[PDB]
Amino acid sequence: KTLQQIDKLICSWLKQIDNVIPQLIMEMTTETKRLVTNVDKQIQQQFQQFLATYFPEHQLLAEEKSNAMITNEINHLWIMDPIDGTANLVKQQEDYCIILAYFYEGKPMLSYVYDYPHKKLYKAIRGEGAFCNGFKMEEPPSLKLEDAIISFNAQVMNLDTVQDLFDASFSYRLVGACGLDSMRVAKGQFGAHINTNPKPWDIAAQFLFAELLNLKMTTLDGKAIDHLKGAPFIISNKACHETVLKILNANGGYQKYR
Amino acid sequence: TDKTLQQIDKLICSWLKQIDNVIPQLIMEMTTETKRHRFDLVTNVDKQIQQQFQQFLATYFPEHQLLAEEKSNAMITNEINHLWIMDPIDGTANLVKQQEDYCIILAYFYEGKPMLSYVYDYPHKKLYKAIRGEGAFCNGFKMEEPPSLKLEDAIISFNAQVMNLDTVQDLFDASFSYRLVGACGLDSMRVAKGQFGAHINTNPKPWDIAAQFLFAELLNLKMTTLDGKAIDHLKGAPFIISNKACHETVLKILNANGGYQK
Ligand SMILES: NC(=O)c1ccc[n+]([C@@H]2O[C@H](COP(=O)([O-])OP(=O)(O)OC[C@H]3O[C@@H](n4cnc5c(N)ncnc54)[C@H](OP(=O)(O)O)[C@@H]3O)[C@@H](O)[C@H]2O)c1
Ligand SMILES: NC(=O)c1ccc[n+]([C@@H]2O[C@H](COP(=O)([O-])OP(=O)(O)OC[C@H]3O[C@@H](n4cnc5c(N)ncnc54)[C@H](OP(=O)(O)O)[C@@H]3O)[C@@H](O)[C@H]2O)c1
Ligand SMILES: [Ca+2]
Ligand SMILES: [Ca+2]
Ligand SMILES: [Ca+2]
Ligand SMILES: [Ca+2]
Ligand SMILES: [Ca+2]
To answer: Is B249 helix (H, G, I), strand (E, B) or coil?
Structure first.
């Protein structure tokens, strides 16, 4: 099973998914948990079927199923967010994506962020590189924080620290889907993106993008992230990583509550 | 020699289209400078787009005057027959940092009454236009009044850096979620399309909002000052563009507790 052969299958499934999604939206149903739609659930279930059929040994860690059965020592693992940006899907029908990442004996090998509304497939392949619709991505120019746009959820952080980030950055922007805000960092459009409480599926693809494009991707302590577990995280241009972490840890830390 | 709105519209949409053929080169040789201070930018792209539009007017509409960001506008008065307001690049910060999420804004006023408006999202090749008597369109798909959105059900957009944190927080608590594209024209079009409930800019110039007046009229949006008053298109004013169903609630929040400033 070469990486290229697997990649062929995935890109092909993603392409057929264009033909399914307009119908799911047509008949869009929404519900609460404490949002999720038929689109989230169906995309996920079809991917499960795809695996059953092409890669029966492979396991799936995904948002809309239980993941109690997933362990540290698993050979072939897919982590999926079937729709990242559900709020955007529901309210805007735009600015949402599918996230897929393949880990072989725990090492990231393939990653996908499919911006379906703009028909832009970001992909990362170990040994080949990272690509947007087959235009090859390269390491972005250095961005010092003062010269860069940052993205984060300001509703979930201490107001002192939110203000410090505003003062230290060039501007603030928010797409509102972790995958897409993270790709803005990979493309050099944003300096950094922060999500203070992500699940494994919110960040799964980003590990390989960060490695191949020389981005820093760490916890808000600067540590490695366990892809099997969440952690408060940042994906950042290498030139503004330290400054952002310094700000987040200043003033008794970034958490809104102690 | 007297032209219909449709004939003017043909000329403008056509000039916008040929502008696609100029811009990739301006971006290739992009240079940037400051104007007022470190966060107040302008590029060859802003200036060139503007100047070519000035030439376009000279040559097709020689009576018509231009109010635009990158020129002095001291000579523009309240009783001007044919006026264009232009923002040659709205979203300069996005142009520079992202090469995405910026637009061109054009609006034609005849004896002070809006007749034609344009928001050209050039990176996505989406031409929003509004024509009195015909309606509003995105690439010639016709736009219609959006469904009612109460604030609690709606995404809002505003610059959180320019308001006090207390009022920012109140807006976050009262809305469904918060998003920011970062170009007035595009954030406003999200309101017109029903994607956002409201967009706020607390200190816009005439070119930041010029096209939005006609869009708001034809699509039944509320577009007012943060006091709920009519805006003078010739001058700024702190402003909101909003779905009709969340307008009052947003203004109430902005004005509460001694206000949104600071
Ligand atoms: N810590 C953060 O930076 C953050 C960011 C967003 C949301 N949230 C929380 O989620 C709830 C609704 O979200 P919102 O409108 O603020 O964001 P949202 O716009 O609904 O979601 C934005 C991004 O955050 C992800 N997300 C959803 N719930 C999350 C959570 N509890 N923690 C971290 N990421 C999450 C989303 O993934 P899906 O689209 O796959 O849901 C999406 O990628 C709120 O209670 C909020 O506190 C936290
Ligand atoms: N690190 C910092 O200290 C920092 C960072 C960001 C902002 N700020 C402060 O916040 C202000 C705005 O900067 P920004 O980068 O957030 O704006 P921005 O993202 O560059 O602009 C967003 C939208 O507002 C328009 N705009 C630009 N300047 C404006 C102004 N002074 N008032 C109202 N609308 C304006 C833009 O139009 P055009 O692109 O067409 O002009 C665009 O439509 C500045 O006065 C600055 O002092 C400070
Ligand atoms: Ca999801
Ligand atoms: Ca997610
Ligand atoms: Ca400007
Ligand atoms: Ca401008
Ligand atoms: Ca502007």
So the answer is: helix
